[PDB]
């Protein structure tokens, strides 16, 4: 293929430059900008007309001039280039390897934006994922094909929870009872706006337990060019969906911090002078986030699946901030961390009252898990809410008015927060979590467990304290 060079640069200011005689440049094409010193920059065509084409420069425009600079076409659509050997490798935000190993050989080249899934082609998510955390596995169960974000704050340990979930994720095919072979499982881990300290932490965490052997890492640092932060989730999702829908993998995708992505999007949009939104964020932010989140799911007639767990920090713990608010309108629930539990030293500090999983009711039950999962989850929620109400009542009018049942709920709440939630670094199984849940359910009278049916009581109402 030949190479075309456009030299009619007529205007440069900020991140934009105009090429006048470039009618052949398609809309959205990727271009290479070369200056007099031979350095090459990247760019994208954001608007093309008969008079000129407008190109947004990926890096800074320092060193460019109207005399020696030239523009060349790379490709019409941004392609990644993927292979099944990417497992165990480590890449930056733009896809280049950063682990020192040689680059891969592409089996195929795929557009990074993707295409929407036909709703007729989808199917309902049906199977659960064992994250190894009781508060998630029992009360907010994750389902293969779901979008389930985690809402955190400033000092809360989101990174540790993400690393633990990445290490401990399994599918548990035995509980399905079908006896099928264990399906391949992989983790795609995309990091945006990460500092060197967190980068080293993640690298060491992945290399400590050998989880890197089944993982693909996309790492974008805070000092990298801004455009690379935008493309990182799209690279990760392209790799994930390629693996899932061409090799029958069950892929789990983790996005470390969507707040940095939103800040990068705001900066890039404001560079082009779009109409501002609620807090300066672009008005099309909902669509932009949807084009990322909507790519997860399961397809009829295929074995693979894509699951997404976005992680984001709520600014000032304000749940009404545009980022968490727009994220909630797209996903199928949320896992919310609590500062009170963090002060109490509980880890992971997941607050079950404001958390919810919308697809949970279809992913658990007989054949999917143990047959008492739904009822014990409901009973746990009811009892914990009652205990929290007792706590709120005590802190105003005094403890002396408490009935025996009220103080029983009061102590059950403390036992719950101390044993069920505060698991530390343990990789609890689903059966272990159910056993613990029943153990502290037996702390209440048998007739008080109103949500649970009589048949599961007695079979599991062992009247035994925890063995841990």
């Amino acid at each position: 293929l030949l190479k075309k060079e456009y030299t009619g640069i007529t205007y440069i200011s900020g991140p934009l430059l105009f090429v006048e005689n470039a009618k052949d440049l398609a809309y959205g094409a990727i271009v290479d900008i070369k200056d007099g010193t031979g350095r090459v920059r990247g760019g994208q065509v954001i608007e093309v007309s008969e008079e000129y084409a407008v190109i947004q420069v990926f890096e800074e425009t320092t060193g460019l001039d109207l005399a020696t600079t030239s523009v060349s076409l790379v490709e019409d659509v941004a392609r990644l280039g993927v292979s099944k050997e990417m497992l165990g490798r480590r890449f930056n935000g733009i896809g280049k390897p950063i682990d020192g190993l040689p680059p891969i050989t592409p089996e195929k080249r795929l557009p990074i934006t993707g295409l929407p899934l036909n709703p007729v082609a989808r199917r309902k998510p049906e199977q659960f994922i064992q994250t190894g955390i009781s508060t998630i596995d029992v009360m907010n169960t994750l389902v293969r094909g779901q979008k389930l974000p985690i809402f955190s704050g400033s000092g809360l340990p989101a990174n540790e929870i993400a690393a633990q979930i990445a290490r401990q994720a399994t599918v548990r095919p035995d509980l399905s009872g079908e006896g099928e072979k264990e399906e391949p499982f992989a983790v795609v881990f995309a990091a945006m706006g990460i500092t060197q300290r967190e980068l080293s932490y993640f690298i060491q965490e992945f290399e400590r337990t050998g989880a890197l052997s089944r993982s693909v890492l996309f790492l974008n640092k805070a000092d990298d060019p801004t455009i690379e932060r935008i493309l990182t989730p799209r690279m990760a999702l392209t790799v994930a969906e390629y693996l899932a829908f061409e090799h029958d993998y069950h892929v789990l995708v983790i996005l470390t911090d969507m707040t940095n992505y939103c800040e990068a999007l705001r900066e890039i949009g404001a560079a082009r002078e779009e109409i501002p939104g609620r807090r300066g964020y672009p008005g099309y932010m909902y669509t932009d986030l949807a084009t990322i989140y909507e790519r997860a799911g399961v397809v009829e007639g295929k074995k693979g699946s894509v699951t997404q767990i976005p992680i984001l920090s709520m600014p000032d713990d304000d749940r009404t901030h545009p980022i968490p608010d727009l994220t909630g309108y797209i996903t199928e629930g949320q896992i919310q961390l609590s500062r009170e539990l963090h002060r109490k030293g509980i880890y992971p500090p997941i607050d079950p009252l404001p958390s919810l999983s919308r697809l949970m009711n279809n992913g658990v039950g007989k054949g999917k898990t143990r047959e008492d999962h739904k009822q014990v989850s409901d009973q746990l929620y009811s009892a914990y809410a009652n205990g929290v109400d007792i706590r709120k009542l005590v802190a105003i009018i005094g403890e002396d008015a408490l009935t025996e049942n009220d103080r029983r709920y009061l102590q059950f709440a403390d036992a719950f927060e101390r044993f069920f939630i505060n698991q530390g670094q343990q990789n609890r199984s689903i059966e272990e979590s159910l056993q613990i849940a029943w153990a502290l359910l037996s702390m209440l009278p048998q007739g008080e467990l109103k949500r649970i049916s009589k048949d599961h009581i007695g079979k599991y109402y062992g009247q035994k304290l925890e063995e841990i």
Binding site: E273, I275, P276, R278, R279, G280
Partner: protein, 41 residues
């Protein structure tokens, strides 16, 4: 106190949004007057 603080920050956000809208309008009108005085030639 927390309710008053939430009200205060809500009002501050509304005022900042209105100021941003006014700035956008000012930039628009300046761009258009420049465009008029230029393209009139």
């Amino acid at each position: 106190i927390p309710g008053i603080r939430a009200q205060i920050r809500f009002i501050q956000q509304v005022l900042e949004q209105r100021e941003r809208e006014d700035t956008f309008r000012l930039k628009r009108i300046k761009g258009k007057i420049e465009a008029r005085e230029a393209e009139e030639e």
